[PDB]
Each structure stands twice: as structure tokens, then as C-alpha cells.
Amino acid sequence: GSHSMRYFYTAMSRPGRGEPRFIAVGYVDDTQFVRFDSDAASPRMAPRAPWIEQEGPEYWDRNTQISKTNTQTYRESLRNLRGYYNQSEAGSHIIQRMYGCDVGPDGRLLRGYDQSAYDGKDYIALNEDLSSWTAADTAAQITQRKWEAAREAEQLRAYLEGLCVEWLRRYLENGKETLQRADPPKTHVTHHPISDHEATLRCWALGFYPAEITLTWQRDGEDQTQDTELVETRPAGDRTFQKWAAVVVPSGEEQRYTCHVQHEGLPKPLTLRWEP
């Protein structure tokens, strides 16, 4: 179906402990494929998925140089934002930025993104038109006017409509055996007695890729949304993900409960029950 490429930048000042650290990671869908860390003994863009390793030295040098330049650029930006908020030189602050593109099954641009936060709070974002900005406050308006004068939105649009989708398409083909393979969840239902009155039914999904999944409990065919404990989807470390959903049921009523699983890797949606 559709696919995404995203870069995630984190720039963190640390007064008294050297200059701000700059980390960049790149993802295609839920697969990380590159990383950069300015704290590394020798900072370079480094592969994190096998299918990117076939890119040649020019690729690695170019993406390394952009990241080293960004290390300096984001240090300038941190100094600037400290001033925009009248903050002292003593505190640690964080700029985060996410940017990238979504493409459809036919590879055409669906939407581009560029969004920034300061100390965990939304700061400035490129609107969906790839042409105008939404600034969170009067400090971000300074960045907005700076980027408007520099026609920076036009530069984002050119990147997002060109290089972003072109290289995403290349990555998807080069890594098609994994990036374009959905692995279904392996599922089971467990039963954990609580008391003579109640027991927990837990519906498990293991080993699935990508992370998008829907796990729900129904009681007599009605969703138990408010009564379902739904753990955050979590990585297994082998590219796959794990999730479970649990509901507390009255003893003897277990067969009124069904777990429903939807995932791209599944031939059809699953309906599971406790099987004692």
C-alpha cells in the first residue's frame, strides 16, 4: 500500500558539558535505516538496515556532510531559541524536528511533512500546502518570518516533491523483500484468574510488521473500549512488534468475549476466543 520516509532530528544543549549533541535517524515505514550522532568518536551517517548498505561512497559522504553541517546549524538554532524565550545560558533545551513524505502504492506523493518542537512543545510546522507555516507562539513567529524571508518553505517543497519521493521509491525497491512484506501477528488468548468472581482474558499479537494493528475485545459483539487495557505497541528487536489487550471478565462468561485482530499481513481479520 502506501509508504513513508521520515527523518527525526534531536538537538540537545548541555551547558558545561560541551556543545549541543545532534542526533538524526531515518526511517522507511517502521524500519530504521540510518543514524548519525555528533557524539560518536568519528561522526558519520551509518547504515542501520542491510538494503541501504549498497549505496556508494558518494551517498555516505554527502549524507555525512549534511549531518555535520546540521550539527552546527542546530547549535545556532538552539542559541537563537534560547534568546527568543529570554532563557538563561544555564538550562538544557531540546529542538526536535520530523520531516518526510508519504507515497501511495503507485509511488506518487501523498503528503509532505516538516514539524518542529522546542522542549517537547510544538513550535513551528509546515502546513500541508508545503507553502505556509503555522507558528505556535510569538517566538516561533520570529523563525516563521526568517523562513519566509529566506523562502525556506519553497526549499522544503522542492525536497519533499523531488528527492524525498525519488529516494523513498529507490529504498522501497532495494529493500522490497522486507519493506514491502507484511508479517502477520501470531496470536493467542490467555486466561488469568483474579478471584472466584473474575478472570483476565489477554489477547496477544506477536511477531508482526509493520506496527499498525488493531486489537479489540468485544462482549456480545460490542466493543469493550473503556474496559480494555491496551498496552503500547512495543518492538521485539527483530524488526517485529508485539501488543496485547486485556479485559476482566466475570467467571463463566468467557465465551461472550471475542478478540478481533486486524493487520495488513493477515489473509483476513481474526476472531479469537479463550479455548480452555
Partner: peptide, 9 residues
């Protein structure tokens, strides 16, 4: 592929 030539904030 990263975007180059970013303007500072």
C-alpha cells in the same frame, strides 16, 4: 536521502 542546506531557526 537527507535535505541539505537547512536554514537555522
Amino acid at each position: 536521502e537527507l535535505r541539505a542546506r537547512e536554514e537555522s531557526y
